[PDB]
Amino acid sequence: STAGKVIKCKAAVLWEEKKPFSIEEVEVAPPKAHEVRIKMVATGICRADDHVVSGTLVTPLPVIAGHEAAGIVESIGEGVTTVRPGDKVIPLFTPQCGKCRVCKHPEGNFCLKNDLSMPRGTMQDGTSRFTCRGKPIHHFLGTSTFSQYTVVDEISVAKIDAASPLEKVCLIGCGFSTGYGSAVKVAKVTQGSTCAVFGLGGVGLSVIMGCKAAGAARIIGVDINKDKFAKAKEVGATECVNPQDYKKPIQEVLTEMSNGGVDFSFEVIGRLDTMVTALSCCQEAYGVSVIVGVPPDSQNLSMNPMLLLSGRTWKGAIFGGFKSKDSVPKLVADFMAKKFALDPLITHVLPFEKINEGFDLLRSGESIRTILTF
Amino acid sequence: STAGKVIKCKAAVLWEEKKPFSIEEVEVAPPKAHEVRIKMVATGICRADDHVVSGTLVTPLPVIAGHEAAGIVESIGEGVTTVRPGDKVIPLFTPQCGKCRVCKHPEGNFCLKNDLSMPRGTMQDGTSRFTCRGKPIHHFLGTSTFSQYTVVDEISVAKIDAASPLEKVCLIGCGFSTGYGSAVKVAKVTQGSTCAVFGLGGVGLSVIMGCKAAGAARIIGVDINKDKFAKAKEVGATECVNPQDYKKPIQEVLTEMSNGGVDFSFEVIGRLDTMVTALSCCQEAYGVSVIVGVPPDSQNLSMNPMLLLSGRTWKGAIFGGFKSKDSVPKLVADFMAKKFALDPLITHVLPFEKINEGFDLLRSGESIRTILTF
Ligand SMILES: NC(=O)C1=CN([C@@H]2O[C@H](COP(=O)(O)OP(=O)(O)OC[C@H]3O[C@@H](n4cnc5c(N)ncnc54)[C@H](O)[C@@H]3O)[C@@H](O)[C@H]2O)C=CC1
Ligand SMILES: NC(=O)C1=CN([C@@H]2O[C@H](COP(=O)(O)OP(=O)(O)OC[C@H]3O[C@@H](n4cnc5c(N)ncnc54)[C@H](O)[C@@H]3O)[C@@H](O)[C@H]2O)C=CC1
Ligand SMILES: O=CNC1CCCCC1
Ligand SMILES: O=CNC1CCCCC1
Ligand SMILES: [Co+2]
Ligand SMILES: [Co+2]
Ligand SMILES: [Zn+2]
Ligand SMILES: [Zn+2]
């Protein structure tokens, strides 16, 4: 009834940076070749969506943001083979094209046909499928989920289990998979190790879940907001430190606590001071430090190269190092087999028309994750 | 007629900074508990020994430097259950105590008993076995090979095969296994990969040899001294670039050459700007950059943490990551099973006395190694 026809629906347009999302009528063009139109069911509010608003993340505007989501395929374009109308899918803000040198590499997952490095805010072919108030409107990371209907390229969508509870597994689109992957696939946390997690937000809690799944002996959570401590021990943190409670700098504190340094340290905040600090607190001969948080744009850190030269490893990752197309289905299937929980991360559920309340709730620090439902 | 008895011999004493070595009669003391005294046969002249003259490396003075050597044991103290008078040994500037947190780790090698973090110029008991002109002379990294006889601790020495040539295998004591180990053990160069090696001195050539043995398909050597390209190509470099020759930054050049980045990059110079350059020229999603060169005292580098967030890995190491007491005896039999050559590294052979000319050589930049013969 709608296949091949323009669809009119509501979307949260961001006309300019640091303002309010405006629920407006939009036209959604039908999918062209190797494109997929999806009817959204639930979308999460992630810190990266706020960075677009605050200007912390530069992407062309006006934009339809959002990138944690689950939806139902409404129609598929010419040549699509991997999904089907009626299929449950999750958009992938990191594509997996299967052809470039990164997709061929056994480990790397930053596919070269992504929209992170040099955001164009368009589809793969360079156009836009969104028109509102007569004019055209930009995409976000090739996903754009803050809309009732969206169009994504086939390389940016993964089919999942048809029984999945869509309104919970949308976290696998970013928040959970990122933190969980940073532990088990990027840092490759070893059993019996000691871990330090800087940041007890949604992503940081998922790091802890990863560390625990890897069987870490001790998992120390670090956050200046002590209210985030309860949830952290809930999901596996063995102890929690507030750096404000200590006279010494925190890397010193964590070094003493761990008898000379932690085996794995995770920066899950997005600050340059805590990146250098996370690296310092891991053991000098073979600590591993993973950067998960995204710093403010175009801005360098200072660090002493001596920290690395004694044996430290310093690495970072997008989307927890997971090849998206490949890993999202397997992650959903592990959730269906109850191999990990996602309820502890969901603190607020709001109808989609309340997107601005969900965002005001993120800047408040109250939420871990707010889910918008359509 | 030497055991337990004080020995007099010639030794290269460094009385202060920025001065020529002074070959003098010294009093080498007897081995105490768990110590070993060694008569030297051949010793190398590495950059680190020169950094002690200038000030690029602080350690107490007067000192008997030198850390790359081979000799034979003459006598041993009480508790020595690992070597015997007359067997060939190589002193290790990185000890392997076998009891500390690092020595028991599967991967670490920066043993906590070193004298690198807080150099202190003594044996492990805090005293000195060297006396010259009546005054106690400090040690250097627990080795001190610029003397005809020396006393090291048991943890700072490994027995090698009894038929090995001591005018060649001494480079396993530093130069070779540092560079070689950085490729094969630290980076773990995968076979079929593209490598970029910054700096084509003694250590850099060793990195290159590690890259070939690892099965690398392309090995690009980077140096501003185009006189080093011949050896580089002789021992494995497929290509050599001089950054002075190009109108563009060298990492742009290397990114084009490698079609978007190298798999592994190595900084074997010791400069802050080439460290972030080497990191940048390796593939943004799965590249690995190993720091081997040692920078000047203090002086923090500045870098964009976005280089790591996309998937890069950045690490450094001491002694190529080799656990010293274990690896050294192995790497010698390797040379004894002819798994690799050490001829192209040794360029100048001087009698020990004329030590200074060897440094003049080194500062000249005219050589790879120079071996001093006893
Ligand atoms: N590399 C990737 O692929 C991804 C990166 N991210 C980034 O992960 C980071 C964390 O994400 P969320 O948990 O959702 O954000 P969040 O704001 O909910 O969590 C941040 C936590 O860090 C705490 N914190 C703030 N300053 C601190 C300080 N000086 N010291 C210690 N703790 C401090 C805060 O109290 C807060 O609890 C974000 O920067 C996000 O952009 C998001 C997902 C994927
Ligand atoms: N991490 C560890 O365990 C150890 C570290 N090292 C360090 O390795 C480094 C190199 O060792 P060597 O080969 O013996 O010294 P070297 O002086 O023979 O080699 C340095 C090379 O770098 C070249 N170079 C200088 N500036 C350059 C620039 N801007 N761009 C490109 N090339 C440049 C020079 O032409 C020179 O050939 C030293 O800094 C040494 O302290 C040495 C032994 C062990
Ligand atoms: O949080 C989701 N995506 C992020 C990944 C890191 C760069 C900014 C966008
Ligand atoms: O070259 C030998 N030893 C080096 C090891 C790294 C720090 C400086 C001294
Ligand atoms: Co996100
Ligand atoms: Co050396
Ligand atoms: Zn790809
Ligand atoms: Zn040890």
PDB file of C-alpha atoms in Angstrom, chain A residues 101-102 105 107-112 114 117 194 258-263 272 275 283-286 291-295 298-306 308-318, chain B residues 101-102 105 107-112 114 117 194 258-263 272 275 283-286 291-295 298-306 308-318:
ATOM      1  CA  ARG A 101      40.442  -3.520   2.932  1.00  0.00           C
ATOM      2  CA  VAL A 102      39.055  -2.960   6.442  1.00  0.00           C
ATOM      3  CA  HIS A 105      40.898  -7.503   7.480  1.00  0.00           C
ATOM      4  CA  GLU A 107      40.126  -7.579  12.956  1.00  0.00           C
ATOM      5  CA  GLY A 108      39.384  -4.014  11.838  1.00  0.00           C
ATOM      6  CA  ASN A 109      35.770  -2.869  11.732  1.00  0.00           C
ATOM      7  CA  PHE A 110      35.966   0.807  10.652  1.00  0.00           C
ATOM      8  CA  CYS A 111      34.612   0.214   7.151  1.00  0.00           C
ATOM      9  CA  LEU A 112      35.939   2.836   4.739  1.00  0.00           C
ATOM     10  CA  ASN A 114      31.389   5.190   6.680  1.00  0.00           C
ATOM     11  CA  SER A 117      35.509  10.622   9.282  1.00  0.00           C
ATOM     12  CA  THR A 194      41.980  -6.197  37.250  1.00  0.00           C
ATOM     13  CA  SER A 258      46.002  -2.474  42.132  1.00  0.00           C
ATOM     14  CA  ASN A 259      49.456  -3.161  43.550  1.00  0.00           C
ATOM     15  CA  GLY A 260      51.223  -1.313  40.750  1.00  0.00           C
ATOM     16  CA  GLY A 261      48.609  -0.829  38.009  1.00  0.00           C
ATOM     17  CA  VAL A 262      45.529  -2.375  36.427  1.00  0.00           C
ATOM     18  CA  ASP A 263      45.642  -4.927  33.624  1.00  0.00           C
ATOM     19  CA  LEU A 272      41.562  14.420  27.225  1.00  0.00           C
ATOM     20  CA  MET A 275      42.516   9.530  28.573  1.00  0.00           C
ATOM     21  CA  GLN A 283      50.537  -1.501  34.668  1.00  0.00           C
ATOM     22  CA  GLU A 284      53.636   0.016  33.079  1.00  0.00           C
ATOM     23  CA  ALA A 285      55.025  -3.266  31.712  1.00  0.00           C
ATOM     24  CA  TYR A 286      51.872  -4.533  29.984  1.00  0.00           C
ATOM     25  CA  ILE A 291      39.745   4.841  24.540  1.00  0.00           C
ATOM     26  CA  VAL A 292      35.980   4.539  24.087  1.00  0.00           C
ATOM     27  CA  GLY A 293      34.832   8.095  24.800  1.00  0.00           C
ATOM     28  CA  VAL A 294      34.917  10.685  22.028  1.00  0.00           C
ATOM     29  CA  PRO A 295      36.777  13.937  22.806  1.00  0.00           C
ATOM     30  CA  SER A 298      39.922  19.191  16.801  1.00  0.00           C
ATOM     31  CA  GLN A 299      41.879  19.276  20.019  1.00  0.00           C
ATOM     32  CA  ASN A 300      45.102  17.484  21.042  1.00  0.00           C
ATOM     33  CA  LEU A 301      46.227  15.818  24.265  1.00  0.00           C
ATOM     34  CA  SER A 302      49.690  16.026  25.790  1.00  0.00           C
ATOM     35  CA  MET A 303      51.291  12.871  27.146  1.00  0.00           C
ATOM     36  CA  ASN A 304      54.723  11.556  28.047  1.00  0.00           C
ATOM     37  CA  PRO A 305      55.838   8.902  25.511  1.00  0.00           C
ATOM     38  CA  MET A 306      57.685   7.119  28.338  1.00  0.00           C
ATOM     39  CA  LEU A 308      54.127   3.484  26.316  1.00  0.00           C
ATOM     40  CA  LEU A 309      57.797   2.651  25.951  1.00  0.00           C
ATOM     41  CA  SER A 310      57.879   0.490  29.112  1.00  0.00           C
ATOM     42  CA  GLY A 311      55.322  -1.884  27.577  1.00  0.00           C
ATOM     43  CA  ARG A 312      51.940  -0.157  27.751  1.00  0.00           C
ATOM     44  CA  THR A 313      49.413  -0.623  24.948  1.00  0.00           C
ATOM     45  CA  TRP A 314      47.127   2.252  23.930  1.00  0.00           C
ATOM     46  CA  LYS A 315      44.272   1.620  21.506  1.00  0.00           C
ATOM     47  CA  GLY A 316      40.774   2.792  20.657  1.00  0.00           C
ATOM     48  CA  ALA A 317      37.701   1.540  18.873  1.00  0.00           C
ATOM     49  CA  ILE A 318      34.454   2.486  17.182  1.00  0.00           C
TER      50      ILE A 318
ATOM     51  CA  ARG B 101      54.462  -9.344  38.962  1.00  0.00           C
ATOM     52  CA  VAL B 102      55.934  -8.670  35.544  1.00  0.00           C
ATOM     53  CA  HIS B 105      52.986 -12.340  33.314  1.00  0.00           C
ATOM     54  CA  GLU B 107      53.751 -11.137  28.003  1.00  0.00           C
ATOM     55  CA  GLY B 108      55.500  -8.503  30.128  1.00  0.00           C
ATOM     56  CA  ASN B 109      59.270  -8.250  30.403  1.00  0.00           C
ATOM     57  CA  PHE B 110      60.070  -4.901  32.107  1.00  0.00           C
ATOM     58  CA  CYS B 111      61.117  -6.697  35.302  1.00  0.00           C
ATOM     59  CA  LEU B 112      60.611  -4.628  38.445  1.00  0.00           C
ATOM     60  CA  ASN B 114      65.480  -3.031  36.682  1.00  0.00           C
ATOM     61  CA  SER B 117      62.894   3.777  35.872  1.00  0.00           C
ATOM     62  CA  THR B 194      53.243  -3.827   4.887  1.00  0.00           C
ATOM     63  CA  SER B 258      50.559   1.761   1.151  1.00  0.00           C
ATOM     64  CA  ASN B 259      47.081   2.482  -0.295  1.00  0.00           C
ATOM     65  CA  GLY B 260      45.615   4.009   2.848  1.00  0.00           C
ATOM     66  CA  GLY B 261      48.114   3.121   5.575  1.00  0.00           C
ATOM     67  CA  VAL B 262      50.676   0.516   6.609  1.00  0.00           C
ATOM     68  CA  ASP B 263      49.836  -2.523   8.719  1.00  0.00           C
ATOM     69  CA  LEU B 272      58.593  13.185  19.368  1.00  0.00           C
ATOM     70  CA  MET B 275      56.412   9.121  16.865  1.00  0.00           C
ATOM     71  CA  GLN B 283      46.097   2.039   8.839  1.00  0.00           C
ATOM     72  CA  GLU B 284      43.473   4.002  10.760  1.00  0.00           C
ATOM     73  CA  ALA B 285      41.269   0.970  11.513  1.00  0.00           C
ATOM     74  CA  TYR B 286      43.719  -1.839  12.332  1.00  0.00           C
ATOM     75  CA  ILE B 291      57.694   2.986  19.671  1.00  0.00           C
ATOM     76  CA  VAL B 292      61.256   1.683  20.022  1.00  0.00           C
ATOM     77  CA  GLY B 293      63.350   4.851  20.045  1.00  0.00           C
ATOM     78  CA  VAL B 294      63.816   6.640  23.362  1.00  0.00           C
ATOM     79  CA  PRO B 295      63.014  10.385  23.452  1.00  0.00           C
ATOM     80  CA  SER B 298      60.798  14.821  29.794  1.00  0.00           C
ATOM     81  CA  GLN B 299      59.230  16.635  26.780  1.00  0.00           C
ATOM     82  CA  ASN B 300      55.612  15.520  26.266  1.00  0.00           C
ATOM     83  CA  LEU B 301      54.283  14.928  22.767  1.00  0.00           C
ATOM     84  CA  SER B 302      51.035  16.342  21.385  1.00  0.00           C
ATOM     85  CA  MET B 303      48.663  14.200  19.337  1.00  0.00           C
ATOM     86  CA  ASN B 304      45.034  13.951  18.218  1.00  0.00           C
ATOM     87  CA  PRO B 305      43.375  11.087  20.150  1.00  0.00           C
ATOM     88  CA  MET B 306      41.092  10.625  17.130  1.00  0.00           C
ATOM     89  CA  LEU B 308      43.411   5.992  18.189  1.00  0.00           C
ATOM     90  CA  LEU B 309      39.602   6.067  18.342  1.00  0.00           C
ATOM     91  CA  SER B 310      39.309   4.746  14.779  1.00  0.00           C
ATOM     92  CA  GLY B 311      41.004   1.465  15.735  1.00  0.00           C
ATOM     93  CA  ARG B 312      44.743   2.124  15.818  1.00  0.00           C
ATOM     94  CA  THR B 313      47.007   0.525  18.425  1.00  0.00           C
ATOM     95  CA  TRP B 314      49.980   2.318  19.909  1.00  0.00           C
ATOM     96  CA  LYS B 315      52.570   0.578  22.108  1.00  0.00           C
ATOM     97  CA  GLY B 316      56.211   0.673  23.127  1.00  0.00           C
ATOM     98  CA  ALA B 317      58.652  -1.825  24.564  1.00  0.00           C
ATOM     99  CA  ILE B 318      62.056  -2.370  26.155  1.00  0.00           C
TER     100      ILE B 318
END
